[PDB]
Symmetry: C2
Subunit: 116 residues, 2 copies
């Protein structure tokens, strides 16, 4: 399955332990597009509808109406993982470059790669 | 449990699906140190001894003798994840800044954040 960075998919993240975000949920593809094209795995960030506002500097708000979600959500760039593509089902949307610039910043904060 | 970016720990990554790296194994802490201090989760990259040389630009070689491993290994910056700290057991070592600069580069390649 070929996916693209910026794509939002449903993925089954279960099973999990403790404070890991689990379940079948929207996730954001954050791996590079070479990996996304040739690798059997993708790297994704969990998205939650449990909150609507950022609590951490690794959170990016998704306005539901603007971005094609049912409900205002938050991308958790502190909740990331590499998944086999067989966990993926439906493509939900693709976030634009302005939104991805924010995700990039949050990802840098989450992994201590701040260059700005 | 307080961990530090650059620390190498054993973590139980199981269960997994498909091409996800699983088992109890050495992993590298790549999350920022605020998260590492106050969060119940850490973000880590899987390390493998199955290979000794980089096959991808997301791979970083660990010379066993230089860095305190039993065997020449490879850090897989394409195999990353957020884990509850309860998966962690033994601290193996702490990689120096010169090595972490290479890991940072590989992580940027893996997540399309190249700024160099």
């Amino acid at each position: 399955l070929i996916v693209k960075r910026g794509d939002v998919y449903f993925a089954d993240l279960s099973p999990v332990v403790g404070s890991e975000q689990g379940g079948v949920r929207p996730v954001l593809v954050i791996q590079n597009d070479i990996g996304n094209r040739f690798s059997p795995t993708a790297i994704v960030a969990a998205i939650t509808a449990q909150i609507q506002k950022a609590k951490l500097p690794t959170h990016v708000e998704i306005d539901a109406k603007r971005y094609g979600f049912e409900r205002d959500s938050v991308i958790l760039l502190e909740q990331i993982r590499t998944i086999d593509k067989q966990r993926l089902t439906d493509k939900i949307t693709h976030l634009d470059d302005e939104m991805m610039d924010k995700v990039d910043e949050a990802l840098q904060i989450s992994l201590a790669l701040i260059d700005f």
